[model samples]
Target: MKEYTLDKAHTDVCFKIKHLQISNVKGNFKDYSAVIDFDPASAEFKKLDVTIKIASVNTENQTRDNHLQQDDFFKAKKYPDMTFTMKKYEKIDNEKGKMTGTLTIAGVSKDIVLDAEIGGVAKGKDGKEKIGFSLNGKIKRSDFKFATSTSTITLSDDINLNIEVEANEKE
Candidate 1:
């Protein structure tokens, strides 16, 4: 089993949500990591583990961002990290596939499927292989206990996820 390390500097975990039933607010967790494992012969993934620090969420609004870390939402103080563990993988084609995983947030865990694609693999200037992946998925806010509050200060229950990562092979 070969191991791969995510490139922290190049990867991003982003999301978007509708606000007050009107517009969208995009945000991302700046601190995250992923350890990926795959088999080259079968083109199948063996493992995928990711962790994201809740405190790193950046929405550009300090007050709103702070509110997100409260008990009603992430409860970042109590559960500082969210994680995902890949349970299964099905390849649809050469560069596309579906990845089923368990996502844990605020100590709540749920099953989710992410649309994954191989952004490609190439050798860097150091002559080492790096694998790129673009992955996206969705999860209901209610599933994670993110309750809806006011009509004026509401957020969409449907949260869209975006993930882009580059992993370097480890010897």
Candidate 2:
């Protein structure tokens, strides 16, 4: 097994949610980390773990972003972090697969499966082997008991996740 180090500069961790039942509001967790244990020959992951800092949540709106950190939403002060730990991966082919993991938020944990696509591996300028991939999925707010104190008539329960990652083998 080989350990892969994240090329954070080339990665994106973002999400989208519907607002007012009309338009979508995009956001991201700017601070996070991932550990990947992979098998190069099979192009498969042996283990994948991720942690996201709740305080780093960004939606581009300061007031809204602050509100999200409050009790009505994440209650970040108490929880402070979210996490995902891979359970298994199902390979469909060389480039497509499904990732199953446990996602924990606000102290609630749930199993989720995400659609994954591999971009293949390549050598970087420094001659390091790099692998790139994207994972996407949608989860309902109610599934994790994530809800606001106020009526959620205008906010969507569905949260769409879009994650892109590039990692280089550890030297």
- Model 2 lDDT per residue over 1-171, tens place: 899989999999999997543789999989999998877678788899999999998999999988888998898989999999999999888788899999999999999998888887778889778899998999888888896565556688899999999999886
Error of 1 at 110 (Å): 0.5
Q: Model 1: clashing residue pairs?
A: none
TM-scores, all candidates, are 0.80, 0.84
**Whole-model lDDT for model 2 versus the true structure?**
0.89
Off by over 4 Å in 2: 1-21, 148-152
lDDT of 1 by residue, 1-171 (tens): 899999999999999987544788999988998889976556677899999999999998889889889887788998999999999999987688999999999888999999988877677779877778888998987777664452223667788999988788899
Each candidate's root-mean-square deviation in Å? 19.4, 19.3
lDDT of each: 0.85, 0.89
Total colliding residue pairs, candidate 1: 0
